[PDB]
Amino acid sequence: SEISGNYEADDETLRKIRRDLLDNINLERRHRDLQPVYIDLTTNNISQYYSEYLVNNEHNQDFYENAKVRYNNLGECELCHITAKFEPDADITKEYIYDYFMEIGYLFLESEEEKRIILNPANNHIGIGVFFDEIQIVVVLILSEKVLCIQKISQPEQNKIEIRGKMLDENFGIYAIRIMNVDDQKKDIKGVGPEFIEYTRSTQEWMASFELELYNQDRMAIEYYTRVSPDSIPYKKKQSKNEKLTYKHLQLRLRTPFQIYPDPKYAAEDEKERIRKEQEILAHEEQERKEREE
Amino acid sequence: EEEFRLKKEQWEIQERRKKEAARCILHFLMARKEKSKKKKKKKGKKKK
Amino acid sequence: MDNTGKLEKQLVTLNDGLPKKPAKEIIEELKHHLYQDFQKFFSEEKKQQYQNNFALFDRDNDKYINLSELKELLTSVNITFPDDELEELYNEFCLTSPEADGINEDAVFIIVSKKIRDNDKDEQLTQAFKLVEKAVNDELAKTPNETKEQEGYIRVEQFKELLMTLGNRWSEEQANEFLKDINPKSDERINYLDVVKKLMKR
C-alpha cells in the first residue's frame, strides 16, 4: 500500500479515449473513402463492459455471449479487443496512457483482423470500451451491420424524449419504435408506430414526441424496428379510431440499452475537446501565418 | 476505541444473524425419524 | 454513375453467437443471476428466516416442500401469493427439479424473490408517481392561469423524457405504447394518475 499508488481513471478521460478511438477510426475510414462510424449504444455499452472484464480476466466467448443476451443484443456482431502490458520500468501518466491509446488505435489500423472488422463496409454500428489496471490496458470494439443508428438522443424538455436516428438501409424505414421488459421479456412495455414518428426518408432519419414518465429507466434496452419500402409507412399519420399498430409486420433492427446519445455529459465533454481542438488549430495557424509573412 | 466499539456492534449484528441461522437449523427435524437403533457402541477406551 | 438504385435490405441477422456453452451451464449461470438479485432484495434476516418457515413444512428434511408447504411458509412470513401464481411458481421449480419432491429451499427462496421483487418493482413505480405529481403540481403552480384540473393532466411533451432516470430503462421506444393504449383524447394530455392506476394494475 505504501509503495504502490492508486491508478483510478476519470469518466471524462474514459469518454475522451473511447470517442478518440472512434474518431481515429472515422478519420482512417474517410482517408480510405470509407463511411464514418456512428456510436451504436449496444456496441458501446457491451464493448465497455467487455474491456472492463478483459483488464482483469481473459477473453470469454460464453461470458460475452451471456452479456449480449442480458443486454438483449441484436444482429451479427464482430469483436476486436486487445490487452497490453506496461513497461517494467516506465512511468505511467495520464498523457502517457492517452498517447498509448492513440498508439493502440494505430496498432488497430496496423492489425488485419481488427482493422477489417472496424472498416467492414457491411457493418455500420460500432461501440468502443476502453479499460485498464495498474499493469495492463485493454481496448474493445463491437461492430455490426444494422439499418438504423442513433445519432442524437436529447433531454431538452424534461418530459419529451427525442432519439434521432438515421436509417442506413433504403428498403427499411423506421416503422416501429417499441420494446419489452428486459427483466420481463414477455412484457411488451411500450412502443408506437408511424402515427407518432417523424420519418424523413431522404435522410431516412426519424424523430418522435410521445409520453412515458419516470417508469423503469436503469437497465433495459431500446428496440428500434423498421419496415420495408419506407414510402408505405404512414409516418405520423392519424390512425383511425378502429386502427391500432401491428408490430407483427414490423422488423426489429436495433436493441441498444437505453442511454442519452449523446448523454449530456458525453455531449458537453465532446464539445469541450472539439472546441479546444479548434483553439489549438487557430493558434497554430496564426503562428504559421506569421512565419510565412516573415 | 471507536473502531473497537464499531466492531463490537458488528459482532452483535452477526450474533443476531447466527441466531437466525439457528432458527433455520431448528426448523427441519420436528419429526424425522427412523430409529438409530442397533450399534454405536464403538467407544474406544483411551480418552482425550 | 446515374445513381442507378437502390433500396437494398441490410437485413440485421440475429446471429450474434447464441451462448455456445451447454444448456446445463446456461442454466447454472441464469440461476446465479437470479440469486444475485435475491441477495440484495432480501436482507440476511429474511434469507435466514425463510428456512425457519420452510423446514417444518419440509418435515422430511429433504429440502423440498410441496406447494402447500410453500404457501404455508409464505403465510408464516406474511407474504402471500394468489393461488394460481403460487401454484405455477412451485410447479415450475418442481419440474426444473424432477428428482425433487417439490420445490427445494432454493426454490422457495426464489419464489419469495419473485414475490418481493414484484413488490419492489411496484414500490419503485409508485414512488415514480410521487415525483411525477410533484413536478406536475410545481409546473402548474408556475402557471397560475392554468386551473387545478391540470393537476393529473400532463402534456405529451410533459410525459416522455421521464423515461431516462430510474429502475430499468424504459427508453424512448419504451416511451411509446402507453399513449396508444390509453388513447390521449385528441388532447395529448393523459392523467399521470391514470398512468398510476394502469401501471400498478400490470
Curated annotation (Swiss-Prot), chain A:
It comes from the Eukaryota. Belongs to the CFAP184 family. Forms a complex with CFAP263; the interaction is required for functional activity in cilia. This is Cilia- and flagella-associated protein 184. It is found in: Cell projection, Cilium. It comes from Tetrahymena thermophila (strain SB210). The chain holds residues 104 to 397 of 794 of the full protein. The lineage of its organism: Eukaryota, Sar, Alveolata, Ciliophora, Intramacronucleata. Disruption phenotype: Mutants swimming speed is reduced compared to wild-type with trajectories wavy and kinky. Cilia length is not affected. In complex with CFAP263, acts as a regulator of ciliary beating that connects radial spoke 3 (RS3) to the inner dynein arm (IDA) and the nexin-dynein regulatory complex (N-DRC). The complex is positioned parallel to N-DRC and forms a connection between the arch at the base of RS3, the IDA tail and N-DRC.
